Motif scaffolding. Structure first.
Motif, mmCIF file in Angstrom:
data_model
loop_
_atom_site.group_PDB
_atom_site.id
_atom_site.type_symbol
_atom_site.label_atom_id
_atom_site.label_comp_id
_atom_site.label_asym_id
_atom_site.label_seq_id
_atom_site.Cartn_x
_atom_site.Cartn_y
_atom_site.Cartn_z
ATOM 1 N N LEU A 203 -3.221 7.564 -0.768
ATOM 2 C CA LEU A 203 -2.269 6.952 -1.679
ATOM 3 C C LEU A 203 -2.998 6.079 -2.714
ATOM 4 O O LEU A 203 -2.640 6.041 -3.885
ATOM 5 C CB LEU A 203 -1.264 6.117 -0.886
ATOM 6 N N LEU A 204 -4.049 5.384 -2.297
ATOM 7 C CA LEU A 204 -4.872 4.591 -3.199
ATOM 8 C C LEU A 204 -6.329 5.006 -2.980
ATOM 9 O O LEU A 204 -6.766 5.346 -1.859
ATOM 10 C CB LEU A 204 -4.757 3.099 -2.864
ATOM 11 N N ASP A 205 -7.098 4.916 -4.069
ATOM 12 C CA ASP A 205 -8.542 5.041 -4.018
ATOM 13 C C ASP A 205 -9.126 3.696 -4.420
ATOM 14 O O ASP A 205 -8.869 3.216 -5.513
ATOM 15 C CB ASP A 205 -8.987 6.203 -4.906
ATOM 16 N N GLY B 178 -3.168 -0.408 -7.956
ATOM 17 C CA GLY B 178 -3.212 -0.699 -6.527
ATOM 18 C C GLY B 178 -2.071 -1.605 -6.066
ATOM 19 O O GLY B 178 -2.063 -2.026 -4.918
ATOM 20 N N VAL C 10 2.879 3.469 -4.960
ATOM 21 C CA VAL C 10 1.884 2.585 -5.532
ATOM 22 C C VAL C 10 1.738 2.879 -7.016
ATOM 23 O O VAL C 10 2.199 3.871 -7.520
ATOM 24 C CB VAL C 10 0.544 2.763 -4.834
ATOM 25 N N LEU C 11 1.013 2.013 -7.688
ATOM 26 C CA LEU C 11 0.636 2.229 -9.062
ATOM 27 C C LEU C 11 -0.885 2.395 -9.138
ATOM 28 O O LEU C 11 -1.610 2.217 -8.180
ATOM 29 C CB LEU C 11 1.068 1.021 -9.893
ATOM 30 N N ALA C 12 -1.385 2.758 -10.311
ATOM 31 C CA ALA C 12 -2.819 2.905 -10.504
ATOM 32 C C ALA C 12 -3.531 1.562 -10.325
ATOM 33 O O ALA C 12 -4.751 1.574 -10.126
ATOM 34 C CB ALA C 12 -3.079 3.487 -11.889
ATOM 35 N N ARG D 30 2.128 6.832 -7.389
ATOM 36 C CA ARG D 30 2.081 7.868 -6.365
ATOM 37 C C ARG D 30 2.831 7.463 -5.109
ATOM 38 O O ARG D 30 2.862 6.286 -4.754
ATOM 39 C CB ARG D 30 0.628 8.193 -6.035
ATOM 40 N N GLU E 108 -11.348 3.927 -7.739
ATOM 41 C CA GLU E 108 -10.571 4.037 -8.963
ATOM 42 C C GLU E 108 -9.811 2.748 -9.245
ATOM 43 O O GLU E 108 -9.713 2.321 -10.391
ATOM 44 C CB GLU E 108 -9.620 5.226 -8.906
ATOM 45 N N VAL E 109 -9.268 2.128 -8.226
ATOM 46 C CA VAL E 109 -8.492 0.941 -8.425
ATOM 47 C C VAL E 109 -9.375 -0.162 -8.979
ATOM 48 O O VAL E 109 -9.021 -0.875 -9.914
ATOM 49 C CB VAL E 109 -7.807 0.509 -7.118
ATOM 50 N N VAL F 231 3.976 8.831 -0.908
ATOM 51 C CA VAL F 231 3.872 9.799 0.170
ATOM 52 C C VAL F 231 5.116 9.723 1.041
ATOM 53 O O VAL F 231 5.883 8.753 0.978
ATOM 54 C CB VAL F 231 2.620 9.581 1.022
ATOM 55 N N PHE G 81 1.654 -2.204 -4.758
ATOM 56 C CA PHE G 81 2.627 -1.431 -4.006
ATOM 57 C C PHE G 81 4.004 -1.826 -4.485
ATOM 58 O O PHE G 81 4.278 -3.000 -4.819
ATOM 59 C CB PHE G 81 2.583 -1.709 -2.509
#
Lengths: 50, 50
Positions: B44-46, A40, A36-38, A27, B49-50, A29, A42
């Motif tokens: 951008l990050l959660d 976390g 970033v990736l899932a 994701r 979830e991470v 912005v 960067f």
């Protein structure tokens, strides 16, 4: 995980290389100069760089 | 001489027309600029979830 075989009273090192391929959501912005990736992690680069 | 129906004679209005029309029923739908989830996803990050 590979761990060294037993030997008596010796420190042993064991290496394990697990190649991993993971499909993740990435994701970004505005101004979209990084994403970033899932996981976390960067990535400091625009998604659109080419 | 003879009889006449009432509609046969021109009728002039002695009345003042006031035309009040009821304010119609209106339904307000649930409208949000951003839903709760959107705002949650805007990050951008959660960390969860991470």
């Amino acid at each position: 995980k590979y761990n060294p075989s037993r030997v008596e009273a010796f420190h042993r090192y064991g290496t394990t290389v697990n190649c991993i391929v993971e499909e993740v959501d990435a994701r970004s912005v505005y101004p979209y100069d990084e994403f970033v990736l899932a996981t976390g992690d960067f990535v400091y680069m625009s998604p659109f760089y080419g | 001489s003879h009889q006449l129906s009432r509609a046969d004679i021109t009728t002039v209005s002695t009345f003042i027309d006031l035309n009040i029309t009821m304010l119609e029923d209106h339904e307000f739908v649930p409208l949000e600029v951003y839903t709760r989830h959107e705002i949650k996803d805007s990050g951008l990050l959660d960390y969860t979830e991470v």
